[PDB]
Design an enzyme around this catalytic site. Sequence first.
Site, mmCIF file in Angstrom:
data_model
loop_
_atom_site.group_PDB
_atom_site.id
_atom_site.type_symbol
_atom_site.label_atom_id
_atom_site.label_comp_id
_atom_site.label_asym_id
_atom_site.label_seq_id
_atom_site.Cartn_x
_atom_site.Cartn_y
_atom_site.Cartn_z
ATOM 1 N N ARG A 155 0.826 -1.230 0.000
ATOM 2 C CA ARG A 155 0.000 0.000 0.000
ATOM 3 C C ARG A 155 0.836 1.245 0.000
ATOM 4 O O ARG A 155 0.412 2.290 -0.493
ATOM 5 C CB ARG A 155 -1.006 0.026 1.179
ATOM 6 C CG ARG A 155 -0.390 0.088 2.575
ATOM 7 C CD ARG A 155 -1.421 -0.026 3.715
ATOM 8 N NE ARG A 155 -1.691 -1.439 4.029
ATOM 9 C CZ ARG A 155 -0.838 -2.270 4.611
ATOM 10 N NH1 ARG A 155 0.373 -1.882 4.989
ATOM 11 N NH2 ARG A 155 -1.206 -3.488 4.799
ATOM 12 N N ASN A 202 0.466 0.559 7.672
ATOM 13 C CA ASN A 202 1.225 1.764 7.396
ATOM 14 C C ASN A 202 1.402 1.989 5.892
ATOM 15 O O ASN A 202 1.328 1.060 5.118
ATOM 16 C CB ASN A 202 2.594 1.750 8.131
ATOM 17 C CG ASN A 202 3.683 1.013 7.340
ATOM 18 O OD1 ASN A 202 4.154 1.521 6.338
ATOM 19 N ND2 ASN A 202 4.108 -0.192 7.813
ATOM 20 N N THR A 214 15.487 8.774 12.564
ATOM 21 C CA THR A 214 16.902 8.458 12.868
ATOM 22 C C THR A 214 17.551 7.505 11.852
ATOM 23 O O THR A 214 18.189 6.501 12.242
ATOM 24 C CB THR A 214 17.019 7.778 14.273
ATOM 25 O OG1 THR A 214 16.195 6.570 14.275
ATOM 26 C CG2 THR A 214 16.633 8.705 15.404
ATOM 27 N N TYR A 217 21.100 5.057 12.423
ATOM 28 C CA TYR A 217 21.563 5.028 13.820
ATOM 29 C C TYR A 217 20.405 4.644 14.736
ATOM 30 O O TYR A 217 19.235 5.007 14.471
ATOM 31 C CB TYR A 217 22.143 6.424 14.251
ATOM 32 C CG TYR A 217 23.189 6.919 13.256
ATOM 33 C CD1 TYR A 217 24.530 6.494 13.348
ATOM 34 C CD2 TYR A 217 22.839 7.786 12.208
ATOM 35 C CE1 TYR A 217 25.475 6.913 12.396
ATOM 36 C CE2 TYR A 217 23.749 8.170 11.241
ATOM 37 C CZ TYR A 217 25.069 7.733 11.341
ATOM 38 O OH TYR A 217 25.966 8.139 10.377
ATOM 39 N N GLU A 369 6.882 -3.924 14.094
ATOM 40 C CA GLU A 369 7.046 -4.310 12.697
ATOM 41 C C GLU A 369 5.963 -3.639 11.853
ATOM 42 O O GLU A 369 6.231 -3.187 10.707
ATOM 43 C CB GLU A 369 6.983 -5.848 12.586
ATOM 44 C CG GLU A 369 7.248 -6.430 11.183
ATOM 45 C CD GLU A 369 6.021 -6.419 10.249
ATOM 46 O OE1 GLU A 369 4.901 -6.103 10.722
ATOM 47 O OE2 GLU A 369 6.204 -6.780 9.060
ATOM 48 N N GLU A 370 4.753 -3.539 12.419
ATOM 49 C CA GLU A 370 3.590 -3.098 11.595
ATOM 50 C C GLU A 370 3.749 -1.654 11.230
ATOM 51 O O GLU A 370 3.114 -1.138 10.302
ATOM 52 C CB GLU A 370 2.276 -3.312 12.356
ATOM 53 C CG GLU A 370 1.878 -4.808 12.538
ATOM 54 C CD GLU A 370 1.550 -5.605 11.258
ATOM 55 O OE1 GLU A 370 1.740 -5.274 10.082
ATOM 56 O OE2 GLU A 370 1.149 -6.709 11.471
ATOM 57 N N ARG A 479 12.697 -17.472 5.054
ATOM 58 C CA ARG A 479 11.390 -17.471 5.727
ATOM 59 C C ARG A 479 10.596 -18.713 5.210
ATOM 60 O O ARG A 479 10.817 -19.189 4.102
ATOM 61 C CB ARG A 479 10.642 -16.161 5.391
ATOM 62 C CG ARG A 479 10.108 -16.051 3.966
ATOM 63 C CD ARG A 479 9.631 -14.648 3.675
ATOM 64 N NE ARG A 479 8.550 -14.193 4.598
ATOM 65 C CZ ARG A 479 7.787 -13.105 4.401
ATOM 66 N NH1 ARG A 479 7.944 -12.337 3.311
ATOM 67 N NH2 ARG A 479 6.879 -12.753 5.328
ATOM 68 N N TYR A 497 -6.666 -10.392 6.716
ATOM 69 C CA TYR A 497 -5.372 -9.729 7.027
ATOM 70 C C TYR A 497 -5.561 -8.337 7.605
ATOM 71 O O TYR A 497 -6.182 -7.496 6.962
ATOM 72 C CB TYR A 497 -4.570 -9.729 5.716
ATOM 73 C CG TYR A 497 -3.352 -8.854 5.646
ATOM 74 C CD1 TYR A 497 -2.170 -9.261 6.259
ATOM 75 C CD2 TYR A 497 -3.366 -7.662 4.919
ATOM 76 C CE1 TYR A 497 -1.014 -8.478 6.187
ATOM 77 C CE2 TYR A 497 -2.216 -6.887 4.833
ATOM 78 C CZ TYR A 497 -1.038 -7.317 5.451
ATOM 79 O OH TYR A 497 0.088 -6.508 5.386
ATOM 80 N N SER A 573 26.804 -3.417 -23.658
ATOM 81 C CA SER A 573 27.135 -4.856 -23.597
ATOM 82 C C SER A 573 26.918 -5.473 -22.223
ATOM 83 O O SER A 573 27.283 -4.865 -21.209
ATOM 84 C CB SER A 573 28.591 -5.111 -24.013
ATOM 85 O OG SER A 573 28.830 -6.516 -24.071
ATOM 86 N N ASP A 609 34.063 -19.235 7.334
ATOM 87 C CA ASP A 609 34.109 -17.776 7.106
ATOM 88 C C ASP A 609 33.870 -17.433 5.650
ATOM 89 O O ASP A 609 33.135 -16.477 5.368
ATOM 90 C CB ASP A 609 35.413 -17.110 7.647
ATOM 91 C CG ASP A 609 35.463 -17.008 9.158
ATOM 92 O OD1 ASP A 609 34.473 -17.350 9.875
ATOM 93 O OD2 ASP A 609 36.514 -16.556 9.677
ATOM 94 N N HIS A 632 22.312 -4.680 -1.162
ATOM 95 C CA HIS A 632 22.558 -5.954 -1.827
ATOM 96 C C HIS A 632 22.384 -5.740 -3.350
ATOM 97 O O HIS A 632 21.372 -5.222 -3.802
ATOM 98 C CB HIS A 632 21.563 -6.975 -1.296
ATOM 99 C CG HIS A 632 21.963 -8.402 -1.502
ATOM 100 N ND1 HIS A 632 22.048 -8.972 -2.760
ATOM 101 C CD2 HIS A 632 22.270 -9.376 -0.611
ATOM 102 C CE1 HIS A 632 22.392 -10.247 -2.633
ATOM 103 N NE2 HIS A 632 22.554 -10.513 -1.344
HETATM 104 CA CA LIG Z 1 17.315 4.529 13.362
HETATM 105 CL CL LIG Z 2 7.627 -14.973 7.768
HETATM 106 ZN ZN LIG Z 3 3.418 -9.459 10.640
HETATM 107 ZN ZN LIG Z 4 1.176 -7.332 9.336
#
Ligand SMILES: [Ca+2]
Ligand SMILES: [Cl-]
Ligand SMILES: [Zn+2]
Ligand SMILES: [Zn+2]
Lengths: 693, 693
Positions: A155, A202, A214, A217, A369-370, A479, A497, A573, A609, A632
């Site tokens: 979203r 969100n 922030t 950091y 997390e949300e 995951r 959801y 190329s 390693d 990445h």
């Molecule tokens: Ca931060």
């Molecule tokens: Cl997951």
């Molecule tokens: Zn979740």
């Molecule tokens: Zn969620």
Amino acid sequence: HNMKAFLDELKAENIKKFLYNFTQIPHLAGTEQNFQLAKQIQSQWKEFGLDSVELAHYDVLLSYPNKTHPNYISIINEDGNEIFNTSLFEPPPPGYENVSDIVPPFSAFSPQGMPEGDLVYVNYARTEDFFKLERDMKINCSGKIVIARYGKVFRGNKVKNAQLAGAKGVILYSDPADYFAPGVKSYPDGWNLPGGGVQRGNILNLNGAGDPLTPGYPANEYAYRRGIAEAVGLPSIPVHPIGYYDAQKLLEKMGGSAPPDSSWRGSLKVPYNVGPGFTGNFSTQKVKMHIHSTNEVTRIYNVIGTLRGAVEPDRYVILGGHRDSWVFGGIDPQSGAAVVHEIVRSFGTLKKEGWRPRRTILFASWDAEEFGLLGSTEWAEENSRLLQERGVAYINADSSIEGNYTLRVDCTPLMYSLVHNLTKELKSPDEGFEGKSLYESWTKKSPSPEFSGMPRISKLGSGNDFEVFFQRLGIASGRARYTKNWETNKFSGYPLYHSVYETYELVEKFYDPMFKYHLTVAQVRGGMVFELANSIVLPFDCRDYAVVLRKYADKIYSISMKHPQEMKTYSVSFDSLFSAVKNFTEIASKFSERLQDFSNPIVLRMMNDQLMFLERAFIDPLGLPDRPFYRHVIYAPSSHNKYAGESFPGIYDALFDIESKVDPSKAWGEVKRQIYVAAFTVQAAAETLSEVA
Amino acid sequence: HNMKAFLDELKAENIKKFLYNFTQIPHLAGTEQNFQLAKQIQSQWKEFGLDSVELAHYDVLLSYPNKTHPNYISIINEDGNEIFNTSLFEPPPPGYENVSDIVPPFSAFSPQGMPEGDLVYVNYARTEDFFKLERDMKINCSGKIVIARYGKVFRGNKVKNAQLAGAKGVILYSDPADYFAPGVKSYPDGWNLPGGGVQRGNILNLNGAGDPLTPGYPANEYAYRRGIAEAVGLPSIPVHPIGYYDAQKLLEKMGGSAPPDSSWRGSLKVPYNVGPGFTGNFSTQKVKMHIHSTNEVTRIYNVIGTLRGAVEPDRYVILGGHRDSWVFGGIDPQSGAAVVHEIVRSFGTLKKEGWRPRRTILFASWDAEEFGLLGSTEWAEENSRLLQERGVAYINADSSIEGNYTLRVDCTPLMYSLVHNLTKELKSPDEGFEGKSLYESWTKKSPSPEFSGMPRISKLGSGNDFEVFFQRLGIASGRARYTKNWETNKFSGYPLYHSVYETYELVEKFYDPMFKYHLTVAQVRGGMVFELANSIVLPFDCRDYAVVLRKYADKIYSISMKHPQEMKTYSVSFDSLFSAVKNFTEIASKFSERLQDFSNPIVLRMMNDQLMFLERAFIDPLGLPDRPFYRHVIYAPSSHNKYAGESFPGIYDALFDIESKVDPSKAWGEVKRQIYVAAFTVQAAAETLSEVA
Ligand SMILES: [Ca+2]
Ligand SMILES: [Cl-]
Ligand SMILES: [Zn+2]
Ligand SMILES: [Zn+2]
Ligand SMILES: *[C@@H]1O[C@H](CO)[C@@H](O[C@@H]2O[C@H](CO)[C@@H](O[C@@H]3O[C@H](CO[C@H]4O[C@H](CO)[C@@H](O)[C@H](O)[C@@H]4O)[C@@H](O)[C@H](O[C@H]4O[C@H](CO)[C@@H](O)[C@H](O)[C@@H]4O)[C@@H]3O)[C@H](O)[C@H]2NC(C)=O)[C@H](O)[C@H]1NC(C)=O
Ligand SMILES: *[C@@H]1O[C@H](CO)[C@@H](O[C@@H]2O[C@H](CO)[C@@H](O[C@@H]3O[C@H](CO[C@H]4O[C@H](CO)[C@@H](O)[C@H](O)[C@@H]4O)[C@@H](O)[C@H](O[C@H]4O[C@H](CO)[C@@H](O)[C@H](O)[C@@H]4O)[C@@H]3O)[C@H](O)[C@H]2NC(C)=O)[C@H](O)[C@H]1NC(C)=O
Ligand SMILES: *[C@@H]1O[C@H](CO[C@@H]2O[C@@H](C)[C@@H](O)[C@@H](O)[C@@H]2O)[C@@H](O[C@@H]2O[C@H](CO)[C@@H](O[C@@H]3O[C@H](CO)[C@@H](O)[C@H](O)[C@@H]3O)[C@H](O)[C@H]2NC(C)=O)[C@H](O)[C@H]1NC(C)=O
Ligand SMILES: *[C@@H]1O[C@H](CO[C@@H]2O[C@@H](C)[C@@H](O)[C@@H](O)[C@@H]2O)[C@@H](O[C@@H]2O[C@H](CO)[C@@H](O[C@@H]3O[C@H](CO)[C@@H](O)[C@H](O)[C@@H]3O)[C@H](O)[C@H]2NC(C)=O)[C@H](O)[C@H]1NC(C)=O
Ligand SMILES: *[C@@H]1O[C@H](CO)[C@@H](O[C@@H]2O[C@H](CO)[C@@H](O[C@@H]3O[C@H](CO)[C@@H](O)[C@H](O)[C@@H]3O)[C@H](O)[C@H]2NC(C)=O)[C@H](O)[C@H]1NC(C)=O
Ligand SMILES: *[C@@H]1O[C@H](CO)[C@@H](O[C@@H]2O[C@H](CO)[C@@H](O[C@@H]3O[C@H](CO)[C@@H](O)[C@H](O)[C@@H]3O)[C@H](O)[C@H]2NC(C)=O)[C@H](O)[C@H]1NC(C)=O
Ligand SMILES: *[C@@H]1O[C@H](CO)[C@@H](O[C@@H]2O[C@H](CO)[C@@H](O[C@@H]3O[C@H](CO)[C@@H](O)[C@H](O)[C@@H]3O)[C@H](O)[C@H]2NC(C)=O)[C@H](O)[C@H]1NC(C)=O
Ligand SMILES: *[C@@H]1O[C@H](CO)[C@@H](O[C@@H]2O[C@H](CO)[C@@H](O[C@@H]3O[C@H](CO)[C@@H](O)[C@H](O)[C@@H]3O)[C@H](O)[C@H]2NC(C)=O)[C@H](O)[C@H]1NC(C)=O
Ligand SMILES: *[C@@H]1O[C@H](CO)[C@@H](O[C@@H]2O[C@H](CO)[C@@H](O)[C@H](O)[C@H]2NC(C)=O)[C@H](O)[C@H]1NC(C)=O
Ligand SMILES: *[C@@H]1O[C@H](CO)[C@@H](O[C@@H]2O[C@H](CO)[C@@H](O)[C@H](O)[C@H]2NC(C)=O)[C@H](O)[C@H]1NC(C)=O
Ligand SMILES: *[C@@H]1O[C@H](CO)[C@@H](O)[C@H](O)[C@H]1NC(C)=O
Ligand SMILES: *[C@@H]1O[C@H](CO)[C@@H](O)[C@H](O)[C@H]1NC(C)=O
Ligand SMILES: *[C@@H]1O[C@H](CO)[C@@H](O)[C@H](O)[C@H]1NC(C)=O
Ligand SMILES: *[C@@H]1O[C@H](CO)[C@@H](O)[C@H](O)[C@H]1NC(C)=O
Ligand SMILES: [Ca+2]
Ligand SMILES: [Cl-]
Ligand code: NA
Ligand code: NA
Ligand SMILES: [Zn+2]
Ligand SMILES: [Zn+2]
């Protein structure tokens, strides 16, 4: 004391009990109840036998509706009378009608405003939906309120796309076409979204930054915070989500142009006219948003459990998933958190009988997390030096189920062999595969498109707490969860959801009555952590990276080859990239031979390693263009859909819509620059696998 | 087969022979002769016994005068007749008057132009010289040609400073006040600069970028290059260096204001008037530059020698110094390169008798240092993943002598104890210290200002090939050479620096007849590499970082405390930084205790990894403001003088000249941000020394 001991100790009945326990009240980030739950998890992980269990806290920007000044949307008439108002809350489910502190539906981080205007319907508000509107249909969104269906993409991208189209507001809604499976009943009598159900979430575009105030950091006690005006990823126009009863009221009067085709029509009994504005009789009526949510710096809490390694305590295998929920979190996240809780309990049982894993295992209960992966990102920012020199792998653990059909795994190529081997040793929980392996049922239901007799494994995308570990820090990540049959079920995600209807009873009655899929996912996730933390040689196969790098190089070259004339004119190329991939294949093959032939712990650890730092070699410390936290070079979240992984993202975005660029020489120059960066990074990663001296 | 065996095998007579060998012809970067020398070094290092010796080549932007269109400066009259011209070459020294391919004096990377105008004399063209001119004296440099004396600071800063003052050209010259020691004769009869001598040198402001066309990535065969207009660090106005005979002609007619004080007057018989323009009779005469040098992408060659470690081959101790010279390189760099050559030879003798160091030693002959540290930086860009996960330490090896008075060491605090201990075991070569240690003579001649009985060791600055390893990648770095008595000798550097007069005979006749100082420096540099590559526990003492961090925190706080009112108004606190430094001191002390108490190679290597990654912990992957390749938070090259190290550079630059900023709230906000970043990085580095789980 081996993997089988670990796996056998895991119980479906325990996961059920934990899920029940974690889902009786809301656990919204930044609230007292989620802090109480944090303290409970910390206590039980100590009881379970972990060596240390600490809370790591941060003060981050969160967003909440104003309790005394509710958010809603109106149809207003020319006089200014509000003739229709959208709901102030979802009808609570049976037995929860008295539960307090259910946050009402809102779009977290929306700015405040009360914009009035004419509606334009923009389908799913994808990049191509806006292309179709602006380029083909000649509809201008400037100063309009856009109404978009949820589904297909994250979203936050919809809101970004609306904002750059010049919208002055966004209304998000759930169409039954995308959230109502044919022949299944609405909650509580089935798993479908009712007309009064609404999806919270969100609408940030953080691009990996973590706390908007922030970036770079940790948001610790002495952190210097940006002003709101300089914060990362906040939307500039008001946004609000609604259900399909209310959406019907807003769409039914829509005038202007017809939908361009049937992919623009949902399932409601409305024309799906694009607009702008309403049909003749109602053409002086307008839509008005009322948004009063506030952004506030709020304390959040991660729980961090440590089980010290016996042989390499300075090597970290991380199992992490979040704890905060939109409301009850019946699936998202507590179906994952209950699985983590039982994994901890099982490892602790072994520990109490005197066992330790070879490497250190860290267990994380993330907060916020949300609201933008805030807890995992701030903690990883705080601990980045430790994680980049010691981080073996990160296994995520959000929702354990999103369906009841088959396994879903998304992970680095470095974990493919580990996953194939583990799943061959696990029992399928599926009807009709009794006494067969999980590998067999999975491969049958979800076949690889490249390789017969192998299962499909997706690239890691984002919209979850592995993002800082994988795309920022380059720690090998994975995951796994149970999922639906996407071939026969065309809806986006699971219907309930981020709604109030996502409850313990949803799971116990409809998704996983016997908790067997939960147990299967505890075995996959826990089994992975077990192997990663205990195998003498790290269980990564570099040759699997070589195979996918070639597939991605073919893909990106094919995209560019749609422009043969420009490739001629600008001397574009791909030779360097293919040469790098060839070298990677050859060096990885030779490394694999050496890894097979060697009592010498230094040679071993030297080679562990090299395996550990191989994901790290794909990180470019300069980041991708204008996305400094996506470092990445092989994988970044799609710039058009944060949930989807993109391969060679730097070259992909340089080529995207290139035919529309004003200065083709400049645009093709940047394609070639990204080819150079990708070829170099692939060669440099290959060289970490060469003999060291 | 121990350190004493290594050290005893080193011979002064060998270093003499190598120096002679490396200095008969010019070895300008990008020239055929320097490629021939590269191949010779590669051959001899193979002969000497190294396991592999390779050339690593890159194609980088270099700068050369036009052979058929010479650079020079004129005084022109109103008619346009050139009544005075500066020299086209330095008079060659005795016996070299027929040597070809002596590059004439030029400022590398100057753009082309022929600007005409009035002269302003700007002293050393330091930040404070321009402050004095613009702020106090009210002299506007806009559209003027500035003439500046060499000395005090890096010439690239002078040119930057002139350019931002609006100069349209810069003339650099060597004043006898700065390059002629009282009572010593000019070359060839002493070590002083003659009136026709001129200092070559680049005038870039690269800030660590390496090749101007490829910042971040090696300038390999498929590299994408920026256009010239987007290149890093090129000056926008023409520049040219001259000697003091020619400078006298340009200064003698200067009018306008008197010098503001005696620190503006050199030693020539001229008034040192600031200008602008000439005195009355000559007021219609003007100065005209003629610069025709060209920038060209040119191939450069590093030689890389490997001596594989017996126990930790994946750990790298690097001895590196450059090979390219401005002309003969009698001091700079061949007095260093001859020392490296003899170090390689000695290690090879041991190797042939069956010995190997514990860790891998890499030996480097860098190219194109004189043109911006280009060879070391491109190679480190190519190999950055290997160096940041495996790099134990970097010891530089440019000029072995810049005087004959005492030792000079600049290095990370992590090497202080190593250096004190090593020098206590070496014989002083100094007259009057026969049978005394190098530590004793050094401490007596160069006492620490903080600590009785200890020698002074400077912070690493820059203007040499350690810059990519230390300030970009955070590998513990050091340098050492013999030096002059700065207390009694007030001149900048050594007088014949980067002139044709810097020859084998300069060294053999005046600096080091017996090659004893060369041998002493081979023992210090080689001894350091030996300990770093062979000690079971890495020879770094984290507690020495704790002591200096406190000193730097006091220093920076004292700077800020010049503004007590603003610290009140904006709530500027250093509490977090001091708290971080306190924690670092306490954690480092506890780590040191553990390092003393432990047959366990994993605990050892775990702890060697903590020692190795401790310098790395000071790197911020976001870099310092607008200097992305200076990533070390404790040390960066001074923004006013690239040669000088600055401590807490982020806070230092935020405070510099803060009283002149237009928006004090914004400026003090950025001070506080830099305090936060510094405190966080110090705490995060401390935490890498905590128990790992
Ligand atoms: Ca931060
Ligand atoms: Cl997951
Ligand atoms: Zn979740
Ligand atoms: Zn969620
Ligand atoms: C995949 O891995 C292979 C190695 O197996 C790499 O191959 C290298 O490719 C580059 C080309 O990009 C080659 O570079 C060429 O080197 C010649 C001299 O090299 C000698 O010295 C090196 C030591 O550095 C030896 O290893 C090597 O064997 C040689 O003896 C140059 O003379 C070439 O330059 C000339 O031609 C070019 C191109 O036509 C012109 O532009 C130049 O102006 C010039 O006239 C050239 O630079 C290199 O030799 C190859 N190495 C090896 C060991 O074979 C691939 O590069 C790698 N793929 C990627 C993406 O890295
Ligand atoms: C130098 O090293 C020391 C450790 O020896 C660090 O000390 C920490 O300092 C911070 C302050 O910056 C302390 O933070 C405070 O924590 C309280 C709760 O912490 C509990 O839980 C933790 C686990 O995370 C335990 O380790 C800890 O002992 C406690 O039991 C909060 O309640 C405090 O917040 C309240 O006060 C502040 C300030 O007045 C208000 O702004 C808040 O709104 C709130 O009311 C506070 O956040 C922390 O407890 C200290 N840790 C320890 C282990 O003692 C230093 O931080 C470190 N220096 C640097 C630069 O890192
Ligand atoms: C849609 O909602 C609006 C606004 O109503 C307010 O916000 C909602 C989300 C709920 O929290 C409501 O309880 C809350 O009132 C309605 O328009 C509003 O109507 C009211 C009452 O008719 C007006 O209040 C005043 O009433 C007294 C008369 O005794 C006078 O002093 C005032 O002059 C005024 O009339 C209110 O002004 C008006 N507000 C706005 C912003 O227009 C609307 O009726 C409703 N529509 C429906 C249900 O169709
Ligand atoms: C300073 O130098 C200038 C330029 O001289 C040139 O550049 C130098 C760096 C050297 O490489 C010189 O060898 C080179 O000539 C002098 O001014 C120049 O003088 C010459 C000769 O007097 C002029 O050449 C021409 O001569 C013939 C006459 O037979 C005519 O065809 C032409 O009309 C022209 O006069 C030349 O034009 C002139 N150049 C410039 C740019 O002004 C200058 O004399 C010298 N000053 C000294 C030594 O005081
Ligand atoms: C979810 O499970 C947890 C853990 O089983 C439950 O929390 C625990 O609840 C018990 C009963 O309330 C607590 O024990 C009590 O302690 C207090 C004094 O501290 C005493 O007055 C009582 O007589 C009783 O012994 C216990 O503190 C608490 N444990 C933890 C670790 O928090 C929780 O109630 C469950 N939640 C739901 C919704 O089922
Ligand atoms: C997943 O399982 C497969 C199948 O067991 C693993 O591959 C197998 O790994 C073993 C042990 O390294 C290989 O054995 C080796 O055989 C050669 C003889 O050819 C010998 O030189 C060695 O001493 C060793 O015994 C075996 O060949 C290999 N089998 C196949 C089919 O590849 C694989 O490693 C597992 N993956 C992970 C990540 O654990
Ligand atoms: C600096 O020292 C080096 C190394 O001692 C000198 O280079 C070497 O010079 C000798 C004599 O020219 C070379 O040997 C010759 O080989 C050729 C065939 O390759 C043959 O025709 C001759 O009869 C003779 O045997 C040798 O190649 C060369 N060695 C290396 C490693 O380059 C160099 O001359 C010295 N330079 C100065 C200025 O003193
Ligand atoms: C530079 O030389 C100094 C002086 O030799 C070195 O410090 C010394 O290091 C030794 C070996 O770690 C320390 O010995 C230890 O003593 C304690 C008993 O108190 C015991 O627990 C250990 O088993 C061990 O024998 C010694 O105390 C220490 N001396 C001083 C005055 O600090 C220093 O390490 C050298 N620096 C480097 C970088 O090598
Ligand atoms: C929630 O919204 C209400 C509006 O109904 C806000 O309360 C008013 O705020 C304004 C501006 O600060 C004041 O002038 C009024 O006196 C307040 N009125 C009342 C009736 O309280 C309130 O600030 C918002 N709450 C939060 C937590 O942001
Ligand atoms: C060195 O400078 C000379 C000027 O004396 C340059 O040669 C001339 O270049 C221009 C422009 O390309 C041509 O039109 C002339 O025909 C050239 N003249 C002569 C006499 O050769 C030359 O390009 C410069 N050399 C380098 C290597 O840059
Ligand atoms: C859309 O409308 C705005 C303002 O009414 C206008 O400035 C803008 O140029 C329009 N854009 C297009 C593409 O028609
Ligand atoms: C569970 O599986 C059955 C049998 O395939 C299916 O009909 C049902 O829709 C599934 N339930 C959910 C919630 O996906
Ligand atoms: C210096 O001179 C230029 C142009 O003649 C002018 O524009 C500029 O403002 C002057 N600056 C000062 C500080 O006097
Ligand atoms: C060498 O040392 C002597 C004795 O102190 C001193 O007079 C002389 O100037 C020195 N030479 C150089 C080149 O510094
Ligand atoms: Ca470069
Ligand atoms: Cl040096
Ligand atoms: Na329910
Ligand atoms: Na000489
Ligand atoms: Zn040098
Ligand atoms: Zn130099």
